[PDB]
Amino acid sequence: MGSMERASLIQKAKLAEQAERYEDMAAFMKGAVEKGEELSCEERNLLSVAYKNVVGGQRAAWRVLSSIEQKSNGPEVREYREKVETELQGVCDTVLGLLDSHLIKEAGDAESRVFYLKMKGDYYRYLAEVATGDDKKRIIDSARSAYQEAMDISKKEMPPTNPIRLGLALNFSVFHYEIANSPEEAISLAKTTFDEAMADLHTLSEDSYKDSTLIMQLLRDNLTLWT
Template identity: 40%
Template sequence: MPCKFCSKPYSSAGSTLDVVKQIKSIVDHFGPQLSTEERSLLSIAYKNITNTLRNSWRIVDTLHKVQSTRKGPVHLIQRQRQRIETELIGVCKDIIRLLDRELLPAASEGEETVFYSKLKGDYCRYLAELGQKRERDRYAELSLKAYRSAYKHALATLHPLHPTRLGLALNFSVFYHDIKQSPERACHLAKSAFDDAVLSVNASDPGMDQTLRDSMAILQLLKDDIILWSGEMKD
């Protein structure tokens, strides 16, 4: 699909930052009603940026913990970890501002609202992973509120096999496991979404074939997490 702003096809050669700037330009010039492809590009661009930073942060944080046990100099590692944290926090807050000010207020009922609310829950969750206690608690609450709103809307408007509904269930259950430290609630939510999707397969119409194929990978991830978290509860 051509870009509204430049009237040319999107190019995969551009950097993720270029994609973010281009989507923001579309919002500024044409309004916040993005196409499905534009929403996907925005999500992938921010995900690529934050995944790189989160992986780097985990590596540096592990090095910091190892070095601390050896009572060696850690100031350089601390400085690098702080630099990554600052950049990651800035990116997360940037997309949350875009969602709150532009995209969510203009979102249509159904998949679009669920998609944006899920994104807000995701990036508030990332901030909750990083912050000190007060900030961590604040962003955990914002993440929970966004996920709950998205899930309530998804149950009312989206088919149980819809990839956006399943992706939301996957990330919401991860929130309960990682942030709330509750494998029981995480497993319950994941299993409920998985069972609803499986039960709806026979009732789906022929037009759901493509959706079913798109959803299979998420169903497998849900199944893997259910097995993992069930094992944790037994332990």
């Protein structure tokens, strides 16, 4: 995308989202990041929406194939699950490469740095969902380390109702439950996050209240599933 203007790539990413063309959206946003400038709040959301949708579809297909393969246990189901897995890993590696070159290192404000470190934890978590080899423990620890750094900044720099802080805690709680085999840590994190946000809702405008309560409901939905 090197020959297209940054502003045109952003415009086309927004069009691609409207047209439900998320692979295109992710390619446009990759091109925008590679221009080398920092991203605004709105642009960070376009980057996350694009890749979350692409990898979400891959994850769903991998789970369908993995279930068939496990019920089966010719080479075709395994081969095709491996093909989908390799493509998923390649998209995660691409996102992680954008974060490492050079989004995280140039992010100084708490909102941008927490956003990118949450993404880093998420894409290592997606790698961990399909990992089995000699690096699986290391992939899990890479997710944990990214989420932990994001948590440390968020607790120092953001109020307990901040939607980025809340979504980070939600996703790190999912990591604890589904990846790290730490359901008690998952439940504790979700409950403490929910309660501390509840106690800060009185400070918020109607529109901020709506955002914080939406994510608090996601925390509650998980606690209901886990308890």
